[PDB]
Design an enzyme around this catalytic site. Sequence first.
Site, PDB file in Angstrom:
ATOM      1  N   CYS A  16       0.798  -1.241   0.000  1.00 55.30           N
ATOM      2  CA  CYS A  16       0.000   0.000   0.000  1.00 55.30           C
ATOM      3  C   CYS A  16       0.842   1.309   0.000  1.00 55.30           C
ATOM      4  O   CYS A  16       0.359   2.365  -0.411  1.00 55.30           O
ATOM      5  CB  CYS A  16      -1.014  -0.037   1.186  1.00 55.30           C
ATOM      6  SG  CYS A  16      -2.303  -1.232   0.793  1.00 55.30           S
TER       7      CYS A  16
HETATM    8 NA    NA Z   1       1.481  -0.129  -4.487  1.00 53.67          NA
END
Ligand code: NA
Length: 373
Positions: A348
Amino acid sequence: KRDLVQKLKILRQELSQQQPQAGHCRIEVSREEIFEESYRQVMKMRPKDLWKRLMIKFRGEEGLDYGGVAREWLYLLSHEMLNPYYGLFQYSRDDIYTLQINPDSAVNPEHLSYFHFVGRIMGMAVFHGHYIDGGFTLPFYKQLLGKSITLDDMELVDPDLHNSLVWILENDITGVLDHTFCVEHNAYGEIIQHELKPNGKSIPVNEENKKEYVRLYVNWRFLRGIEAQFLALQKGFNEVIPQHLLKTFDEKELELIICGLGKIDVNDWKVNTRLKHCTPDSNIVKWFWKAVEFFDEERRARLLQFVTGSSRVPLQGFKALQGAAGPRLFTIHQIDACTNNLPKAHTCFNRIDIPPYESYEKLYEKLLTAIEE
Ligand code: NA
């Protein structure tokens, strides 16, 4: 690969004209059921609705900022939907980097509706400038552009068939071949007779069957078993991004705008990397890049995938690397952890956590153990 930017500026200009002035595309879904819940809301919408400004909310969550929630929804969903778990796509037994349509997707009777949904999502990703981690073959994209498969397209797809068809065209096959316009395939244990054209008890002849034989065979073989899936996908995609807007693109250029570049420039990577708890001159940073320099293209693809969730890079380069909610540069974070540990990624945030390994050779080996398998 130089006027592609200008093609893409023209496309994104014409698409912004497509966006209505008023209204929003509202979505409200849980993070834990993002695929199924997005599916239900998005398939209630008309193609016009999909061009509207995004207004997204995660169930139970207020959200820092609408723009950021929307990027995050698009990032997470386009990530899930390509996951073999959902039954639409699989990696080739022939190559675990090539993404392909699952030919058994019909075990879910509503499968075509989900292909249509994925098409729409891919279209919305191009519409909003997001890159999907897309592993499809070049003939897939040319099919998305409405272009015919060619015999050249068989080189990767079916390399023995390629040779067979090249030989048919280049040599007087009168007599030896003894084939008709009916081709045989084993599907699900059973031999299926497929006629390439009405009355396919026309024998292949030089006498100008043969060129038509090859063109029909080639287009049959590519989408074989996956015709309906592909059609629904293509239809979802072009409801968002009309085919006329794509008329100046070829398959290589479409691939690049959908999932970015597969050639990894290590200089661009190095220069766009942030450091946390390690300095530009430290051993761990020196050794990390030394390993990357030695790593071949597959190893670099596995490393990029390990750290970021994708093996490809934005057209804009590493300065444009995508985190879950917006731009996040590749980051090396040196951590206080046991040096027997492997690097850990947080995809992320495009971040890799690296223990203080005691030599290059140790870093090199631990990094390989983490990214292979
Ligand atoms: Na990413």
